[PDB]
Coordinates of C-alpha atoms and ligand atoms in Angstrom, one line a residue:
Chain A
X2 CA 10.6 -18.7 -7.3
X3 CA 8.4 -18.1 -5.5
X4 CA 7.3 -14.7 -3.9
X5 CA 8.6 -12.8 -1.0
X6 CA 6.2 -10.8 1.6
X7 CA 7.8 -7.9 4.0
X8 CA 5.6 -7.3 6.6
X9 CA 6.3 -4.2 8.4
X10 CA 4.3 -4.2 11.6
X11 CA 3.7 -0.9 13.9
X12 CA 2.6 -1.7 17.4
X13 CA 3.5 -1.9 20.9
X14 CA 1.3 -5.3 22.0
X15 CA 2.1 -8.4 20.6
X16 CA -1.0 -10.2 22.5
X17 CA -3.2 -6.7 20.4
X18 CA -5.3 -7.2 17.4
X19 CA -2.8 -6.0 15.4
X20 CA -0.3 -9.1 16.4
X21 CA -2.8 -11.4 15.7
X22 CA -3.3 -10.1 12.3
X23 CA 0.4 -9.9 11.6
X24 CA 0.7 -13.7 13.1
X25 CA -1.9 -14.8 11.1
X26 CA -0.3 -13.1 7.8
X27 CA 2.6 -14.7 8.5
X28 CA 1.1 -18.2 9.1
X29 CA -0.7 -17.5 6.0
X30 CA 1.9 -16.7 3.3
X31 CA 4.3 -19.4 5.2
X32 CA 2.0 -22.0 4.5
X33 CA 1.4 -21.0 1.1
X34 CA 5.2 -21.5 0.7
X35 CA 5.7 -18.2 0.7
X36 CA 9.2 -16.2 1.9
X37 CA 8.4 -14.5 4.9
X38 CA 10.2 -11.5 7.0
X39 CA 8.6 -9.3 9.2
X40 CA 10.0 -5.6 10.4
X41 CA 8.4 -5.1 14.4
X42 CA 9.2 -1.7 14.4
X43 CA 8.8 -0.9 17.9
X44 CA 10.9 -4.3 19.3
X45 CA 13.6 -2.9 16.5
X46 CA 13.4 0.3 18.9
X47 CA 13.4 1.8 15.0
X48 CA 14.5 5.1 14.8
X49 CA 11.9 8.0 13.3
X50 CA 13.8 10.7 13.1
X51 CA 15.1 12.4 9.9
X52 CA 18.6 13.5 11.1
X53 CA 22.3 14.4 10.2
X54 CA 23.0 10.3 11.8
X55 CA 21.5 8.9 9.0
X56 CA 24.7 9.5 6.6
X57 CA 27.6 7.7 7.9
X58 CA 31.3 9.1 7.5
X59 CA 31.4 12.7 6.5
X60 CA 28.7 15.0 4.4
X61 CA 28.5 16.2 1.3
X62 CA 28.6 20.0 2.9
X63 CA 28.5 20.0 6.7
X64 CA 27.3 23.8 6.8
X65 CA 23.6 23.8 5.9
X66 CA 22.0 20.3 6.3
X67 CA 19.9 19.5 3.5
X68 CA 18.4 16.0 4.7
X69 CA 16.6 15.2 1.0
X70 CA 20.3 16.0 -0.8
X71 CA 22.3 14.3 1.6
X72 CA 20.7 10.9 2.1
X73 CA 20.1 10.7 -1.9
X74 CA 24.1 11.3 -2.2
X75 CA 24.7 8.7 0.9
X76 CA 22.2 6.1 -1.3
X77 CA 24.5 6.7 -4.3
X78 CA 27.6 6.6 -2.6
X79 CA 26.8 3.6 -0.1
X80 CA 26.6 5.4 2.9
X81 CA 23.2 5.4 4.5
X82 CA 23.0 4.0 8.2
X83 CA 22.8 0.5 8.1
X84 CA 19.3 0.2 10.1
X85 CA 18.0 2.3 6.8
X86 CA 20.4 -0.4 4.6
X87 CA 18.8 -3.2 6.2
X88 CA 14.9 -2.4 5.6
X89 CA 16.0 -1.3 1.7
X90 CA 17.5 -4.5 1.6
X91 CA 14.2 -6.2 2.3
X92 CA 12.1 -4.2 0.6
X93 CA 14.6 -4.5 -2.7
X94 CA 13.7 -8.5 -2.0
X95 CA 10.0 -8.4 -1.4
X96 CA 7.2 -8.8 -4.6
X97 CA 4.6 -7.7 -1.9
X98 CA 5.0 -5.3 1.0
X99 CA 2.0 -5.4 3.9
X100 CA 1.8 -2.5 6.7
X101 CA 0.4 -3.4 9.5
X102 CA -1.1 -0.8 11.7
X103 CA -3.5 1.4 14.1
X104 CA -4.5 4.1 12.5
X105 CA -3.2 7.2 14.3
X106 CA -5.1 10.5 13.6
X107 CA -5.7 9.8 10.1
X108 CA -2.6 8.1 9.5
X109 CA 0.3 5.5 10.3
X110 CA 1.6 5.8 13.4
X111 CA 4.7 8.2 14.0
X112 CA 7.4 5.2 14.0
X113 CA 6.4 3.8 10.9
X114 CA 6.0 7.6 9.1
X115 CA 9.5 7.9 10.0
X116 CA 10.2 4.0 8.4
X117 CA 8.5 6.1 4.8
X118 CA 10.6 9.1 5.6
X119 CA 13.9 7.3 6.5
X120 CA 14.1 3.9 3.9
X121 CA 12.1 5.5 0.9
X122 CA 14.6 7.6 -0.3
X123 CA 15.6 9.5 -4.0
X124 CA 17.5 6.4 -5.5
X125 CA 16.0 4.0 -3.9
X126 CA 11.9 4.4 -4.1
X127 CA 12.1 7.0 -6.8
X128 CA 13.9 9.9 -8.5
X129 CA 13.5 12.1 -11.7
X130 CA 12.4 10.4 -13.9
X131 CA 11.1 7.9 -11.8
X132 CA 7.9 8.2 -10.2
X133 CA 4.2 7.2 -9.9
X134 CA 3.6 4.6 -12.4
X135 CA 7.7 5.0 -13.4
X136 CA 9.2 4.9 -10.0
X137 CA 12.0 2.4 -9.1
X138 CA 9.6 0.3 -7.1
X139 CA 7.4 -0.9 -10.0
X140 CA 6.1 -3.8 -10.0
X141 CA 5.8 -4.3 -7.0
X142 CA 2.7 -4.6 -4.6
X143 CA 1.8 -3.0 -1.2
X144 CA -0.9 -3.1 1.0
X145 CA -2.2 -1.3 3.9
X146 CA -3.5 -3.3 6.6
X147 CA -5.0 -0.7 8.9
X148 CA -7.0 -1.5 12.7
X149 CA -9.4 1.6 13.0
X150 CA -10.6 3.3 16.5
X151 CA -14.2 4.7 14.5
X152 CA -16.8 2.0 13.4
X153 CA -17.5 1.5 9.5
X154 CA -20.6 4.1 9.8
X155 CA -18.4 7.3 11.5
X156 CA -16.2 6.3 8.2
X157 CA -18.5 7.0 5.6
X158 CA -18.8 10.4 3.3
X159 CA -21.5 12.0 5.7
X160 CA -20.1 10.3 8.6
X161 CA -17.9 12.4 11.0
X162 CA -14.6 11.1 10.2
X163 CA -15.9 11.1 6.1
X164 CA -14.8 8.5 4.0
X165 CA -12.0 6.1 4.4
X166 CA -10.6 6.6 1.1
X167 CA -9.9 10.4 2.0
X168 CA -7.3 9.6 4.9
X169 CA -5.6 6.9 2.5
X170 CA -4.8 9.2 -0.3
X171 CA -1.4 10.2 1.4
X172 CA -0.5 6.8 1.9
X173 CA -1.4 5.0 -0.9
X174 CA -1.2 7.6 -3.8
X175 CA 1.8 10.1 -2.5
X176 CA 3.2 7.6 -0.9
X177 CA 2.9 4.1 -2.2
X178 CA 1.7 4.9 -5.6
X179 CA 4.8 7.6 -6.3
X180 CA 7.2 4.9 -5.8
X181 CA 5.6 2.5 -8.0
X182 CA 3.8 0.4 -5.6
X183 CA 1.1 -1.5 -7.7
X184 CA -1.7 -1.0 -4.4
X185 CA -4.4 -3.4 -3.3
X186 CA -7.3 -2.8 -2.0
X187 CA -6.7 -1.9 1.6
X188 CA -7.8 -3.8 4.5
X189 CA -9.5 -2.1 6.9
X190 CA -10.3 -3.6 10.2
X191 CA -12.8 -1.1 11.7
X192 CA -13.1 -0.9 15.4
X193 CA -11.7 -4.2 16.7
X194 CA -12.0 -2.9 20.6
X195 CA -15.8 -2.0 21.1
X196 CA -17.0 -5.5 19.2
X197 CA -17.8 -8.9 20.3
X198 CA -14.9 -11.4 20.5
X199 CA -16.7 -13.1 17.7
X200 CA -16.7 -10.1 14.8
X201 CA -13.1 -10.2 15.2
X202 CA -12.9 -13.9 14.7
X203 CA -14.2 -12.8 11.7
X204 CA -12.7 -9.9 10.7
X205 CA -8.7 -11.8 11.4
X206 CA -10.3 -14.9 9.1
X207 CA -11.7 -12.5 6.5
X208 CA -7.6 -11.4 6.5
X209 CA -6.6 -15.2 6.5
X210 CA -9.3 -15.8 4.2
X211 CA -8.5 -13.4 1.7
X212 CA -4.6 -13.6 1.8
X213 CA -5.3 -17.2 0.1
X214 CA -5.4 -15.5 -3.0
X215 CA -3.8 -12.7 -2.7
X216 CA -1.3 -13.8 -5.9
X217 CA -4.4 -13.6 -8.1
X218 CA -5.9 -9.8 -7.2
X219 CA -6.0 -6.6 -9.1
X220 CA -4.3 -3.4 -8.0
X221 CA -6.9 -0.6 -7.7
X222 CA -6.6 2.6 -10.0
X223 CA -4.5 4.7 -7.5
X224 CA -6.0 8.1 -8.8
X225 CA -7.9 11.1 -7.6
X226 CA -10.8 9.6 -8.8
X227 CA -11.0 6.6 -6.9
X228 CA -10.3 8.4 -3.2
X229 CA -12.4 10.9 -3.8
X230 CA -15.0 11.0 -7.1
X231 CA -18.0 8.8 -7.7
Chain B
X2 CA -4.3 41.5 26.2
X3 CA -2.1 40.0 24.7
X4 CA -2.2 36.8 22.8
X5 CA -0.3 33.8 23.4
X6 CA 1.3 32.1 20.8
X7 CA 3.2 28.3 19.9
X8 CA 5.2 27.8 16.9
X9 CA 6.0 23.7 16.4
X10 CA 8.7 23.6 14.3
X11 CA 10.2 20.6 12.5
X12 CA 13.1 21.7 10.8
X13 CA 17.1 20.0 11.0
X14 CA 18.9 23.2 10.0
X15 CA 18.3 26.9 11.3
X16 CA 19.5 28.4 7.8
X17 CA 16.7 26.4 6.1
X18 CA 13.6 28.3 4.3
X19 CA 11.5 27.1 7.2
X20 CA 13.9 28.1 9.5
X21 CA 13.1 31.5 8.3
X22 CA 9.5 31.6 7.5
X23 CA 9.7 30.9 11.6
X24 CA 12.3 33.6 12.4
X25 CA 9.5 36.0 10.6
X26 CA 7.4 34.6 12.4
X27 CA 9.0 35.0 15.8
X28 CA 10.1 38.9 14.9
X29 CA 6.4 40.0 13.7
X30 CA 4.4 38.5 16.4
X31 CA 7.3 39.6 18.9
X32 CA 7.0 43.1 17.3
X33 CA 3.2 43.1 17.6
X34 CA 3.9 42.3 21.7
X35 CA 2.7 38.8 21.3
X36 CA 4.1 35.9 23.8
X37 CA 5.6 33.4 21.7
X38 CA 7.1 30.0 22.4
X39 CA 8.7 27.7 19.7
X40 CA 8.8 24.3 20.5
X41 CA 12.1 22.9 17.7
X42 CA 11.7 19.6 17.6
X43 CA 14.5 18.7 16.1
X44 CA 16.9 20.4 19.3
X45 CA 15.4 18.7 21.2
X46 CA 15.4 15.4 20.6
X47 CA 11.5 15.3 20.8
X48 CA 10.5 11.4 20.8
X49 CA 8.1 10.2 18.3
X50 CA 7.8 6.7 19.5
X51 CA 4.3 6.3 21.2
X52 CA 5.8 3.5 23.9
X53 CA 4.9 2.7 27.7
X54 CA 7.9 4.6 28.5
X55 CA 5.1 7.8 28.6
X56 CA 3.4 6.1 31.6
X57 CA 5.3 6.3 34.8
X58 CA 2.8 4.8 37.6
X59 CA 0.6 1.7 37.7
X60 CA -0.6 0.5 34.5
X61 CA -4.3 -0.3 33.8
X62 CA -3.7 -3.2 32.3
X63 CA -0.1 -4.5 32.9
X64 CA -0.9 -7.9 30.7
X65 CA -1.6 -6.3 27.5
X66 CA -0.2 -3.1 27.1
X67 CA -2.6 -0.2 25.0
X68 CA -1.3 2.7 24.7
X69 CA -4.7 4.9 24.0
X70 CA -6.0 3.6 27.2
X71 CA -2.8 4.0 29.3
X72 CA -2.1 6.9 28.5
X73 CA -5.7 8.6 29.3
X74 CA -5.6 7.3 32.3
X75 CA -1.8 8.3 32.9
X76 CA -3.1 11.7 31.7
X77 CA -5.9 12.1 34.7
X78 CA -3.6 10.4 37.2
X79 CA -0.8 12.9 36.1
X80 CA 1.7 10.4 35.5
X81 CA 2.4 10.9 31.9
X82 CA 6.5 11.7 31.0
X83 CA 7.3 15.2 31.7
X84 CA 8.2 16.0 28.0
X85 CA 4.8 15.3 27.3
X86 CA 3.0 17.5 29.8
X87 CA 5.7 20.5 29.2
X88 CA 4.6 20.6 25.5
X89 CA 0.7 20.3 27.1
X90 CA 0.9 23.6 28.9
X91 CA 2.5 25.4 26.3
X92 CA -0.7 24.3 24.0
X93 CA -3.2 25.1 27.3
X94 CA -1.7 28.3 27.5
X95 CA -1.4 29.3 23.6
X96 CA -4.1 30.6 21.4
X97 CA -3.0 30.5 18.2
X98 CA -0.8 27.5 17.4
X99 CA 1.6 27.0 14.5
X100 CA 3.0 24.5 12.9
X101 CA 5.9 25.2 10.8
X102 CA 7.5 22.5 8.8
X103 CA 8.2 20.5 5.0
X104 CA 6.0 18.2 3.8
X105 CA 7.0 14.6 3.9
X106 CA 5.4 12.1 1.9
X107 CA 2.0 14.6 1.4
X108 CA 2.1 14.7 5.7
X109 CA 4.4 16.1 8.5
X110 CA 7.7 15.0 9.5
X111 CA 7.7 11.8 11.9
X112 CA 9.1 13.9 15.1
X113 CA 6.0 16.2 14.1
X114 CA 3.8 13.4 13.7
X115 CA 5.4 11.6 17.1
X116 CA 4.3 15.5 18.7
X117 CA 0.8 15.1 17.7
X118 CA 0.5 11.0 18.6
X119 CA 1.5 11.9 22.5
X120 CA 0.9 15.5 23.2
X121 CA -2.7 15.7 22.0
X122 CA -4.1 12.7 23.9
X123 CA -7.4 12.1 25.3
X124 CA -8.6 13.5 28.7
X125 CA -6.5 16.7 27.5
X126 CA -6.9 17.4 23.5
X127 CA -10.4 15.7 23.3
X128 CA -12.6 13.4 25.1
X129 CA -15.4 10.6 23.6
X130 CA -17.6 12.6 23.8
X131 CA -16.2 15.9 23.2
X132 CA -14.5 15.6 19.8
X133 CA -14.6 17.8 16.5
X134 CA -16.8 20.7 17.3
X135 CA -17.1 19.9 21.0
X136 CA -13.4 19.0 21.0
X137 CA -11.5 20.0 24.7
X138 CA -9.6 22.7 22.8
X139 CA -12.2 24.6 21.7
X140 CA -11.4 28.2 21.3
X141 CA -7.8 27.8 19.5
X142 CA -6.4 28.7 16.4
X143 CA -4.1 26.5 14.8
X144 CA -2.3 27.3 11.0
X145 CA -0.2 25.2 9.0
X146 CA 2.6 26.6 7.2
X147 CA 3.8 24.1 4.9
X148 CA 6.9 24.0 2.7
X149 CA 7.0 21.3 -0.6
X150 CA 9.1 20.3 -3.2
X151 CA 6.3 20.2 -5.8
X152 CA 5.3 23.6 -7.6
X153 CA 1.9 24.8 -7.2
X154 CA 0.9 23.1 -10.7
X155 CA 1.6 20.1 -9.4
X156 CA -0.8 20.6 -6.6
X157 CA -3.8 21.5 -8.8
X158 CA -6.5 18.9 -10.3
X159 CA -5.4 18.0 -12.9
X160 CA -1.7 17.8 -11.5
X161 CA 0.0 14.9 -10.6
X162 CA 0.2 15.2 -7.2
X163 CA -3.6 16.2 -6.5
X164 CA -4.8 19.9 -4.9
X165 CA -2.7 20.9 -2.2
X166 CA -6.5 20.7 -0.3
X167 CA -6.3 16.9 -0.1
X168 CA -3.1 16.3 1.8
X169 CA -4.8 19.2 4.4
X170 CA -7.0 16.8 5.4
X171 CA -6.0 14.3 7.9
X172 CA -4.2 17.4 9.5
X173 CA -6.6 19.8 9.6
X174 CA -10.0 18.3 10.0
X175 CA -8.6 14.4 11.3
X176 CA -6.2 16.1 13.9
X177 CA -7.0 20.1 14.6
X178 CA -10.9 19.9 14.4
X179 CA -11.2 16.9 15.8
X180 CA -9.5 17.9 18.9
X181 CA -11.5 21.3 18.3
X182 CA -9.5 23.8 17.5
X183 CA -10.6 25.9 14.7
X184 CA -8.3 25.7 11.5
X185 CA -6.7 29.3 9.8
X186 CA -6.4 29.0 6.1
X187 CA -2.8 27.6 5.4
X188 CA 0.2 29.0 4.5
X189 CA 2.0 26.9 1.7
X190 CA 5.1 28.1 0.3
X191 CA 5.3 25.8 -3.2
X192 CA 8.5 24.8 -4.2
X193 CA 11.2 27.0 -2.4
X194 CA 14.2 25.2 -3.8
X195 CA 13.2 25.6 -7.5
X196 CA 12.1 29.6 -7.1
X197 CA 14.2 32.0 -7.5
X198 CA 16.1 34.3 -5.2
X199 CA 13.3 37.1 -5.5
X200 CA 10.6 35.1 -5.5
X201 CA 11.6 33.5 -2.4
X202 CA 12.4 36.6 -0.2
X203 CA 8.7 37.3 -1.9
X204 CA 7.7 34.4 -0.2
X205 CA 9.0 35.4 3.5
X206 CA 7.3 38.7 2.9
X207 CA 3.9 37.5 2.5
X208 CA 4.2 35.2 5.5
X209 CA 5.6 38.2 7.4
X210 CA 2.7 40.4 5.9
X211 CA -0.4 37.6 6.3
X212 CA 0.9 37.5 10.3
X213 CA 0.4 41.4 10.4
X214 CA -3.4 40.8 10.0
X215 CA -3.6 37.2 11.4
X216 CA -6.2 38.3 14.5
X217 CA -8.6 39.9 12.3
X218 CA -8.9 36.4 10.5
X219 CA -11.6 34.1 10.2
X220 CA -11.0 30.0 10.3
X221 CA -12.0 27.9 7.2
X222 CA -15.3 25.8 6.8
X223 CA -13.1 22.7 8.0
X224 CA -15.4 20.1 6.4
X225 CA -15.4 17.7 3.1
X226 CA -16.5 20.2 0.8
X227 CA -13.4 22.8 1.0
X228 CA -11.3 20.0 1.5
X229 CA -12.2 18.2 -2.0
X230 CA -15.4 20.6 -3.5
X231 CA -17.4 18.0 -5.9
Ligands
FAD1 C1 -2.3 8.3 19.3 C2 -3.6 7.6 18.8 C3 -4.2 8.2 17.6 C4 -5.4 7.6 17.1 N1 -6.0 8.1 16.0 C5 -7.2 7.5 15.5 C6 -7.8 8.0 14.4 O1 -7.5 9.0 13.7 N2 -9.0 7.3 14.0 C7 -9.4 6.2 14.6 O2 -10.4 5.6 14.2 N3 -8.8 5.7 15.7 C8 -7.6 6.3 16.2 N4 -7.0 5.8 17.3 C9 -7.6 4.5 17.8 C10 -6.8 3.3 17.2 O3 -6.8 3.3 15.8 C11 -7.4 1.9 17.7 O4 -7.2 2.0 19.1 C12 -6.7 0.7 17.1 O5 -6.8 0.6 15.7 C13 -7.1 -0.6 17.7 O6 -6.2 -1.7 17.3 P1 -5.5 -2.6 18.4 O7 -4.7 -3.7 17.7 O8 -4.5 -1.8 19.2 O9 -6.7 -3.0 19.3 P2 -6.6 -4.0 20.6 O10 -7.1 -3.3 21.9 O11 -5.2 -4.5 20.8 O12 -7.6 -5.1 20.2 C14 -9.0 -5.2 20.5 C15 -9.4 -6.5 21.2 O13 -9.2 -7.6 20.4 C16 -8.5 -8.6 21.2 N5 -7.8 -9.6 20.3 C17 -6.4 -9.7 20.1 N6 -6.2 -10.6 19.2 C18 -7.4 -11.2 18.8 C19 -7.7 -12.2 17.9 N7 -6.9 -13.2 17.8 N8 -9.1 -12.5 17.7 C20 -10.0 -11.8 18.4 N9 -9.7 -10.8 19.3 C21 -8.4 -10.5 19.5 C22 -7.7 -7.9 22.1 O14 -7.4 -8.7 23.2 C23 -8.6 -6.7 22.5 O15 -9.5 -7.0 23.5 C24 -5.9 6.4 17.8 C25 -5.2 5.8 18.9 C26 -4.1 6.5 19.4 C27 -3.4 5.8 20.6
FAD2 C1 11.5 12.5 3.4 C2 11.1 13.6 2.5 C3 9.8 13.5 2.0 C4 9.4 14.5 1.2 N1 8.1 14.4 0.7 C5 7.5 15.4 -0.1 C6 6.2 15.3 -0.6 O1 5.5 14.4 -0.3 N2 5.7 16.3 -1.5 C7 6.5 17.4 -1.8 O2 6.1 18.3 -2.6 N3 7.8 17.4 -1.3 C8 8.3 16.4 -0.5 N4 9.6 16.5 0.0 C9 10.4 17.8 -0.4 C10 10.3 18.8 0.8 O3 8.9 19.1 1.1 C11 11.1 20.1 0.5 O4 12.4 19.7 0.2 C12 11.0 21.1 1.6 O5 9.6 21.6 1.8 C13 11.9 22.3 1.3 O6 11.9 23.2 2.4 P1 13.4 23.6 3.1 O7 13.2 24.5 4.3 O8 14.1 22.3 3.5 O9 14.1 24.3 1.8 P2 15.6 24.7 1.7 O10 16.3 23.7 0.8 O11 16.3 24.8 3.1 O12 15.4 26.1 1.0 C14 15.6 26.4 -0.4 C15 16.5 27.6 -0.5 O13 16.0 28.8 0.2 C16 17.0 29.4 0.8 N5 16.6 30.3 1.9 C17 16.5 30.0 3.2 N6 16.1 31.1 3.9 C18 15.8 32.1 2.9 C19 15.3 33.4 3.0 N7 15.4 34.1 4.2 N8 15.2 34.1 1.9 C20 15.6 33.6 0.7 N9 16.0 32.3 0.6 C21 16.2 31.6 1.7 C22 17.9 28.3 1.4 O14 19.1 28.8 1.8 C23 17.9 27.4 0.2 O15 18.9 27.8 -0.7 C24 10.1 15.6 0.8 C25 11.4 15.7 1.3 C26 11.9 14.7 2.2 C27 13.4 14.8 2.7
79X3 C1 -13.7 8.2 15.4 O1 -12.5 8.8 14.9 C2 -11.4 9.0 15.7 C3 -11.3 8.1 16.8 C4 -10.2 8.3 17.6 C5 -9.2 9.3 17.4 C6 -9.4 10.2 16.3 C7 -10.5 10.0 15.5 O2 -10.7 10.8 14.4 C8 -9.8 11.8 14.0 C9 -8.2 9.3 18.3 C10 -7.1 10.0 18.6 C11 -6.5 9.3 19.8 C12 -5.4 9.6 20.6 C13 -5.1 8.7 21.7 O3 -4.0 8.9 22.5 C14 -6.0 7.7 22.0 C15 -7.1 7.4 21.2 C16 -7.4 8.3 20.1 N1 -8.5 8.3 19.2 C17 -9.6 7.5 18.8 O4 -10.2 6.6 19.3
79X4 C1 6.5 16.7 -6.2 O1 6.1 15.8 -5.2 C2 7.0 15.2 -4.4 C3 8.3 15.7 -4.2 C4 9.1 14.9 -3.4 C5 8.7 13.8 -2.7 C6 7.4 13.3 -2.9 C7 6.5 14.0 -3.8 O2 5.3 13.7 -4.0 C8 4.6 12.7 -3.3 C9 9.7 13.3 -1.9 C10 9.9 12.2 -1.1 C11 11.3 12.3 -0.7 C12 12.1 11.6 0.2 C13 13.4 12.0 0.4 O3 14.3 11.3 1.2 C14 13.9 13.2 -0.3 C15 13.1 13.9 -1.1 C16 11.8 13.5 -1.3 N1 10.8 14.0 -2.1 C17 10.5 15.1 -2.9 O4 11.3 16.1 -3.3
ZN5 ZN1 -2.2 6.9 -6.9
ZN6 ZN1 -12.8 19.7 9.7

């Protein structure tokens, strides 16, 4: 060994500047020598929902549904639906998770919130006492790869949209950070759409550039602090 | 007269405490001779999936498939799927709306999330220009009423899981303001499974009591400041 890298990639558009930046990831970390998978979420036709279907066989008390019980006793007892199975598998594997992704009003798009709802579940990504810096996924690093509709100036902390760093606290720190995810920096590709076929050049060899040495990086402090102090 | 009123509601089981907080909800407005309409996601079936299965006619651009631009331009046209444009009149209509659900991962529920990806699109929730203040649903209310697993210490500062105030904000300000609505303090119920019996029939009450006086209130500043002080 050797490193593995999941991609999990959110968008409709393979030809999109999203594709390209998952494409070029994987082109990346493959020549690197790198072990590569990638979760397409929307040609998996992945399933969002948090329902009763996610426990197969019968439920630990079939009167009132308690999704957060129930999929924590299916996890124990080997009985989650095997599409949920499948990406735990890969993400038990993988030293480095990327997510790969428009930004959706202030957030990952519905189809991958239901990926965080529906693989990371108690006894997999965390439980008591496992969580933030002791949670079951430690060591571990993850990385948001974001495409933004808003240039870099409507992101700033007397833009409109305020800082960047304020939308990524749910992701990173309640998220990422309370499974044990060790996170890097984002990336933030701001406003592919309304630039010149040359800034993007840029911005997907910035990505190619800097996944080069990605092995060598620090985790940022995941805290209140660094989202939202000075 | 004679307000109009929406509850979305993302909840699996009826008998849950958010299955009640929105029975209160139904009875007191009801009582009050309010119109109300609850959209349950979960019953039925609501797709999260942002996919070109929401378009119906022509596409703009058949090569490479966008979704934010097909589906503004399906919105004008009037070809957008049916289950989207029911759940647009009952927001044209309404002037208060809820949203009634448990947080997920310091956010709403992916079917929730999947409701506010395809319902509020632009040409009918906002238009560039004609965003945040100038947003196309200027005029509305909209309240969260939140459910979490975390107490309220947890929730402060100097808890682990950050003021409640910082999760608010890609909902409120990213989402609700943006598309102009103006934002009702929100109702969070901290930690129902954890409280006791008394304290949780408590915390029906005070829903039930806050919507007694909900028309005499006014929104929130819905900027940076209230969101994370400093
Ligand atoms: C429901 C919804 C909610 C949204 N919420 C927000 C929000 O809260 N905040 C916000 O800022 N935005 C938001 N947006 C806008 C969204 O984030 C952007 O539309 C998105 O990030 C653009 O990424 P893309 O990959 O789809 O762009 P694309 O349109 O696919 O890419 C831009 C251009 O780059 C070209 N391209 C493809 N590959 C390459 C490459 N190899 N090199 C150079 N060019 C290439 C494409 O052909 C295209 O012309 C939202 C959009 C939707 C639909
Ligand atoms: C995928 C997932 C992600 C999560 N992410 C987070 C997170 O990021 N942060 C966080 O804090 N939490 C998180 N949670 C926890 C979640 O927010 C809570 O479990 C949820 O808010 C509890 O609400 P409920 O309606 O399901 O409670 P229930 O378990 O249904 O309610 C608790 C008790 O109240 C009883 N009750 C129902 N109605 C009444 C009434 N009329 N009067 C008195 N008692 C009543 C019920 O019968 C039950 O016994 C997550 C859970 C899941 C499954
Ligand atoms: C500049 O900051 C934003 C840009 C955009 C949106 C939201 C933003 O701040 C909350 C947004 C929602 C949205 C929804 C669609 O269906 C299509 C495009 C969208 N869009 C953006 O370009
Ligand atoms: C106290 O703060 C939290 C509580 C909980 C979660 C996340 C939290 O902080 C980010 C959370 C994720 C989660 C996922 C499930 O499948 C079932 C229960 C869950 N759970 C909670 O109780
Ligand atoms: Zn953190
Ligand atoms: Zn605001």
């Amino acid at each position: 060994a050797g490193k593995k890298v999941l991609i999990v990639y959110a968008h409709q558009e393979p030809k999109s500047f999203n594709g390209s930046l998952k494409n070029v990831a994987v082109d990346e970390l493959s020549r690197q020598g790198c072990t590569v998978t990638v979760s397409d979420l929307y040609a998996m036709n992945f399933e969002p929902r948090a329902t009763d279907k996610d426990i197969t066989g019968t439920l630990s008390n079939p009167e009132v549904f308690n999704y957060g019980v129930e999929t924590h006793e299916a996890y124990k007892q080997r009985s989650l639906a095997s599409d949920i199975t499948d990406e735990q598998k890969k993400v038990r594997e993988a030293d480095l998770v990327i997510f790969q992704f428009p930004l959706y009003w202030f957030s990952v798009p519905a189809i991958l919130k239901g990926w965080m709802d529906r693989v990371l579940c108690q006894g997999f990504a965390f439980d008591i006492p496992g969580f933030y810096d002791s949670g079951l996924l430690q060591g571990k690093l993850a990385l948001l790869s974001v495409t933004t509709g808003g240039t870099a100036e409507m992101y700033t902390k007397t833009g409109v949209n305020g800082d960047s760093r304020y939308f990524l606290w749910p992701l990173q720190h309640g998220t990422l950070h309370f499974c044990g995810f060790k996170v890097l920096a984002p990336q933030i590709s701001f406003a592919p759409e309304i630039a010149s076929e040359e800034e993007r050049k840029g911005m997907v060899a910035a990505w190619s550039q800097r996944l080069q040495t990605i092995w060598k990086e620090e985790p940022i402090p995941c805290t209140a602090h660094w989202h939202f102090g000075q």
